[PDB]
Amino acid sequence: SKVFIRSAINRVHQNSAANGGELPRIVFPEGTSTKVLKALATLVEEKICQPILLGYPERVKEKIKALDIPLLNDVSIVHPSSHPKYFSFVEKLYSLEQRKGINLGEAERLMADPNYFAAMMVNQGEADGMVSGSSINYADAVRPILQTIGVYKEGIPAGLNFVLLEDKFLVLADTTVNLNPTAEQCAQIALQAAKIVEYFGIEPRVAMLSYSNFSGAEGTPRKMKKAAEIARSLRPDLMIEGDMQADTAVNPEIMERLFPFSGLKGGANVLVFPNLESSNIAYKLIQQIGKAEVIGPFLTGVRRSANVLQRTTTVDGIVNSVVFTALEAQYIKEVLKS
Amino acid sequence: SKVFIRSAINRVHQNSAANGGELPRIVFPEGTSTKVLKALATLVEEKICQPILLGYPERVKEKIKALDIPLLNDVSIVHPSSHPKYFSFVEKLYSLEQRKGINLGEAERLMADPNYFAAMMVNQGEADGMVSGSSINYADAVRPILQTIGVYKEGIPAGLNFVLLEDKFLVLADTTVNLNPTAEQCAQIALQAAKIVEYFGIEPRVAMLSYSNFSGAEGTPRKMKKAAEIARSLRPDLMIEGDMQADTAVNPEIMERLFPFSGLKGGANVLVFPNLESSNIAYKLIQQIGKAEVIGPFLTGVRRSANVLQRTTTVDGIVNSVVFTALEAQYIKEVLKS
Amino acid sequence: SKVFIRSAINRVHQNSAANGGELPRIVFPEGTSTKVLKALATLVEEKICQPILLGYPERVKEKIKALDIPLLNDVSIVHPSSHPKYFSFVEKLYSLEQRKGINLGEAERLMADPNYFAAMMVNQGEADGMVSGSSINYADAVRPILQTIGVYKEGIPAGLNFVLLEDKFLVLADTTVNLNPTAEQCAQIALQAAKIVEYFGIEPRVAMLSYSNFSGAEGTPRKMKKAAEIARSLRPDLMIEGDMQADTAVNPEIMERLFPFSGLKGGANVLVFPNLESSNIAYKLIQQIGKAEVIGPFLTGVRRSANVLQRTTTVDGIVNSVVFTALEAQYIKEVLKSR
Amino acid sequence: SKVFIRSAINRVHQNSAANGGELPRIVFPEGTSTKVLKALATLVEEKICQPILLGYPERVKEKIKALDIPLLNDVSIVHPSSHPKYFSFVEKLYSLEQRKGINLGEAERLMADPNYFAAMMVNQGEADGMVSGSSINYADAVRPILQTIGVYKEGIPAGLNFVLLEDKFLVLADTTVNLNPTAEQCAQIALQAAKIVEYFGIEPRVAMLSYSNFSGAEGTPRKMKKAAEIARSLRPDLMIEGDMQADTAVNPEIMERLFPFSGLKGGANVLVFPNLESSNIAYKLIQQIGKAEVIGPFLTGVRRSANVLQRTTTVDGIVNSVVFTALEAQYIKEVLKS
Amino acid sequence: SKVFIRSAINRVHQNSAANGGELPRIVFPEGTSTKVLKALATLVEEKICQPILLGYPERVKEKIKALDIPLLNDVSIVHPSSHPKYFSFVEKLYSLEQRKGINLGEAERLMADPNYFAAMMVNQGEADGMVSGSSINYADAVRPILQTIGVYKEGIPAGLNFVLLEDKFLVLADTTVNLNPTAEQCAQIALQAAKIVEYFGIEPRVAMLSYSNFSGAEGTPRKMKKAAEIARSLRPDLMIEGDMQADTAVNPEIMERLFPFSGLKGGANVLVFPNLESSNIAYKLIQQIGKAEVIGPFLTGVRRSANVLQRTTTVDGIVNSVVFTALEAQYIKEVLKS
Amino acid sequence: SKVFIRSAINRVHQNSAANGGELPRIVFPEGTSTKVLKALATLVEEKICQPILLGYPERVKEKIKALDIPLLNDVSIVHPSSHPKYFSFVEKLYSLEQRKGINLGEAERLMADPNYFAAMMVNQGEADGMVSGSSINYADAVRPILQTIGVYKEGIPAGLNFVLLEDKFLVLADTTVNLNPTAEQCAQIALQAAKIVEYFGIEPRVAMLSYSNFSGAEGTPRKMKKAAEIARSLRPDLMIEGDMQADTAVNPEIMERLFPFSGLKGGANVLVFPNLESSNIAYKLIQQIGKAEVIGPFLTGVRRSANVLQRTTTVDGIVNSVVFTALEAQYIKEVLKS
């Protein structure tokens, strides 16, 4: 329920009150987006972020009034190629990609794209985070983030979703990025997801999912089994298990009845998938047919706070997303300070 | 929820009358299975089938007595190797597999196993159907069925599940058999699933699922796109579409909003998966954390009625499986009669 | 030298002539390109085409006056998203690409880009041809063209260059598109190049090039041998031979001394390459250290007239390319009329 | 051009003057080859080497007699199987190849062949160098050399050509040996070609060629980029760059205008190719339709002086090859000193 | 011929005496096998082991009486699931394979099979050795052994045969297990077979067989050449050579005449094969038409004494196999004592 | 078994007597080979062929005198490059191979080689057959034969051997040419061996060999099973069976006892192998350790009579080879006749 979301919002507020009442600056490349503007309407009342819109200030304000949203009257609106830092931004993209097939004119056009300008703003500290992708497909939204902000060391870019049940939440990954991760990659995805779960003061219990129950046969079963093993080696305090079926994974009673030798007791709260088909289809089906709220996807593995909305998002979806992006922004900022 | 199930039960009873009051003979290989016996208690109350249990008669009746299930007192009990037709069953399997690495002694040992004896019984018309796999893994349960009964022509063996929502039901396949079906195979899975949906007087609307929305890129998007094309060609009367995401697939509003050129209007009620990981994980997660009853899996494509319980089944699940196994047994009976 | 080009220019003029005097309309996506503007300066004096510039009309006219090029003051300038057919163009692109991962907003942004807009103009007959790619790399320039105009049936997109020697010309293909064409693809490239050579009233004589002389060993020698064979089957009237080395191919005397069984007599004037590396590197090296004129690349296999300049082009290069583009446009116009 | 050859000949004359007046012994397997005979007339009218002819003395001397070239005189003529060291040569070949499917009779028949005899002569110091391949195809011509003389450590056999422009010369490699070299191999070829350029007191400027300008995309662009990086690591003092197009490589002005971040200034004089097709077709087309004198190929990577004439060679071509073979024999001699 | 076999027999008598009066316990899963029983008749006459038969004791007794075999009236007969150690056996198998897809019921059902019970008996020391596989194919017989007894450190499971010539004996491997062993694997098989030949106080001279004589060509020639080199490195005192042909390998005169450089003199007595076709077909053809006695196969690489009979065996074959099973059991027993 | 060989010799005498007394002309490229000459001593006494020796006449006759072989100094001796037909032979090889990387000079050098010249003589009818390879390896001897004479339509070049037992002879193929023949190829080898066996008035009974008995598993079992199937379709009058083990194949009792459904009764006399390792090693092992005489290999599938001695041949071996070569030459000549 929205118990989880309100707890998150309050955690934002304790962080903000803990830092002089400052709010995180969040860039929205899609400054003219109906759904983004409506979500922001809700979001600026509850003091969750300082929003920054990208686009022509004129038609952004004209669509704000068209949409009848008066508390957006004053929000910062930035036109990328008109910004003072534009050309240095361009020189920085060009410098990082001139041996990946990009000439200076192309760097110019790319930096004029709000997605790239946003990613660069976050990289350059002109913002604390960004939220994009309501109007474009995921790959196109995420490419500038990966090229400009990039991943931290031994991290891997991986999408993550929360499934909110009455008792607890489950975490699902990688729901958006990697088609068919290796065992090593699957373990790294488990580690990132585990750390996220720990941030909420929850004990991570991790299952490596398969169509198989503890078979270890060639292909995905041995893949998920060996993923469990690698992960366990990297973090021996954790309950991490696989290969197993999904129902075996979440249902403690089934696990105990059928596989009492298993190291995973009490049901898994972290679900790592073997390929993008299973993760993507699963989160989306649970979101539409199940009676549980699903929030995300959230992009893990990267050096700064940047999340891509799924194109099928709702206005509430965007709201939840901006909330957790704000939390993330605050968290990364503290680490930078230290 | 149970409305659909009660509808099925009444169609079982309505078919049995107008067919001489006959109940389908359903053989259960696991004659001593607790979950099977308890489910059968419910099931013989409801006049759904004549159950035939396989095992050593004294051990069967003494566990019936242990569980104190007084109405499984007169059910038929068969011991495979003591049965009159045992020796001929052995010779028929031996003639079928003597060049697939199986000698006469091995055929004897195999036919003495209840799964194989059950499969043979059904193949030979000594039973109308079978239900197995409550105690063993799916692969092991399904093997004798496939070797002995086999598929009808241009069929493909594929598991299918029902998701029961308040207004409608969804169908998911292939949830159990094929690791990584080709486009041709996926199209066939869609056709089989389609006719199952038609049996209940529902119009089949088919989505070929992917992590992509109409991208047609190399790999899974291209596979499912071309699957949609083959399926459409074989049945130009059906709404069949892909490649698409799951939420796009089921939600008519999202579809209309984002992809109005689509041939699928009003949401899909048939969901065909690109690989076993995605189908298997999806049905089990929807079943465990959503709030829909999920029934199956049911083995489609095969010449006689034979379905394998998932190892994680409950007693109630076994009851549902037997209901639809009964319906299927009846249907296949009239076809044979023709 | 200057002979081949002046003959081409004169052929453009004889074509505009028994046609009402109409000049092909050629669209240029890069309305502000210095090199494009200088080339057009030279070319409009030569009466070969009606140029159309794409871009914001004020930045175009400001670049024209800055370069002090008075003969362009008159020329048509179009801004894609302001143009009347913009939205129907958007709808036609979307309809072409909505199952290739492109949504309507994406079709709009694409059509607002001059490369796509020019491609659609040419496709829709609002222009007779296009010349692009002075400022972007070849893959990016050529993509909108293939997606929009596309190939005619069993055609294959292939870059072609003229090597202009004192007596004769050589044609080189495929110099820009296919990384590693199959034997069937090499054959189709050869036929395309052949018909181009015939257009100038020359008999096409075709060599499938390799690092080997008539070995047929596995890999490329075998590929070019079977290419030579497929080509011959599809056109038994042409001298087509391979696998052979390049000097063997161009030099008639080497051929007759060393491989008299060869079906190619008198030196090849058509050179089909085994992979993109060899064709691309070869034409560029000949152009840089050779003392012969090299023209192109020209995009063959596509249903309408559309050519992509090499990014390393000079002003004269663009002049030549536009000339032969005007020619291609006239020809394709007549074919379109006929069908 | 003419100056280049004249200077090469003069550097031979200085090497000879620096050593008592000794000229390198060069073996010609093709003792009856017309082209070889005329070219030799020229070659020690100009004091370049002591030629050794291989063949049946009577017919080599009768074709010397036919063509009326008579300070080819008492020029040394050796018949392989008649030579005193013939059986010791036979055993040395046998020891080298008895585990490569070569028996004693086979070593005998092979050693009686002038190509093998020549190679062994050079290995054993009965000669200083060899020039062959006027009458047979390159692979066969080069095989005895690679088996008998071999490569120096971490050297790689690679054909090299000079394009003589009369401002400067270019080197092209590998034009004859390797079909599809790895990035590592491309790097080693670059090093070999660089040292040859240094021999003439010129700064080697090295381009790793492609159809791409600094893209690094999968396939050859990534290959040539990673070759340039490897070579730079092995030789931090050299301008080495890639991936790039050919005209980009040779033209300094194009490079500076379009790719100013490049580490290669003033145009490349060393061109390393991604595969044999491109190199072979390039050198040959330049030689036949440009107006630039091209000399070679010359075989680099081998432990002693040995070159293979392209069968399409001219008589002057042979003269040039012998000039540089003599140069190389001298260079190797002083390096052997210390 | 049989000189070798009774020498084998009385040396068995020599250990049984050298440790009191102990006879090895040898378990026979195939208690109702006619050929096994007839063989046991001969074998219990000559005091080589204490035989244990597996099966229902009375149908074993009925088959013993029918065949009129008076010396088996006394032999121990055990029914697996009636045995005291049965469930503990089940549980230790369950623990060994629970992550390789075997649940507790499956482990129960498997342990009820004589092959598995026999393997477990030998592993747990309720027997010293086992002989199986007369009635079932080799793969099925050898599986319980590999799962239960398994391989010793870096050993590899491999079948070995003796060809008994009048002057000498040859050993052939791997005749049963590996389809296409690598060069390393071939080397390990060679080392193992070598220690077997040494046990009989014979000097092992090892040939890595091929269709080639010292060619080292790609495929099998290279593989066997490198196998010889690895083997030689692992064991520098042994004559180990290849790649070579079979006649070259066994015939010393051919070896010296045609390949005198070879490091293997006097003919090979250890023959390692490149793939299973060649070894299997070779041993069988020699046994049938070669007019020589062939004994085995014997399973090498395994931690306890366990051998699988070929299905095509005779009674005499079974007799020989049991003899050497006893020998293997005793050697292993004493080194287990250590 | 000299009965079989003397039957062969006498059947030659009847063929030559039945066509005027003409003996087949057999070319021996190795005119100076000791073993070939000693063999010819035996062979010309018994009127088996008119031998033709290749080489320089003087050193041929001088080794004939050295070896003290008086019955040979009238035998015809041909020096290839001195022969009247040399140039026409050259142009014919050249026309055959000018597009396989062979130039006219290369055609000259090849034709001057005795192996090529012998092959061309036989091809062109200047001889009836050839025998070679006593002194070189099999691939090199067989190459000119395959290039010059070639295969008849849908034939495949395959080495065949006879194993001569008391009662029976066996045929083994392909023992020398194909590394890993497809099912189609194994079938074709079976047909070729079959017609050879029919020639001696024996009924061919064909087994497709494997390490498996009727398993049909992936790899070799499936291959040999489908080979058996194809062969049966191409020759419906023959008993042809597989996959089976070698002892299964040869032993009729093992066959009926264990696989009575098998189509092969009375033991196979034609053994087709799955790969070159197995055939080659089997053939050589039977020849060295089993004492049955082994004759061959003989090259089947080719348009004219040409056989290659194994390099390990004895003199007696060569005599046998020439005998059956003569027979083959006579049969082929009658085929040519009509």
Residue numbers in the entry:
A (entry chain B), B (entry chain A), D (entry chain D), E (entry chain F), F (entry chain E): 439 to 776
C (entry chain C): 439 to 777
From the paper:
Bacterial hybrid malic enzymes (MaeB grouping, multidomain) catalyse the transformation of malate to pyruvate, and are a major contributor to cellular reducing power and carbon flux. Distinct from other malic enzyme subtypes, the hybrid enzymes are regulated by acetyl-CoA, a molecular indicator of the metabolic state of the cell. The larger ME isoforms (hybrid enzymes) are predicted to be a fusion of two unrelated enzymes; a catalytic N-terminal ME subunit and a C-terminal phosphotransacetylase (PTA) domain. The PTA domain is homologous to PTA enzymes (that interconvert acetyl-CoA and phosphate to CoA and acetyl phosphate), yet they appear to lack critical catalytic residues and thus acts as a sensor instead.
An extension from d1 (residues 524–550, forming a loop with two helices that we term the 3′ loop) sits over the 3′-phosphate group, interacting via residues R535 and K538. Using HPLC as a readout, we were able to prevent acetyl-CoA binding by mutating R535 that makes a direct contact to the 3′ phosphate group. Variants R535E and R535A abolished acetyl-CoA binding, and generated an enzyme insensitive to allosteric inhibition by both CoA and acetyl-CoA, although these mutants retained ~70% activity to wild-type (wt) MaeB. We were also able to generate structures for R535E, R535A and N718D PTA domain variants, which demonstrate the same features as the wt PTAapo structure.
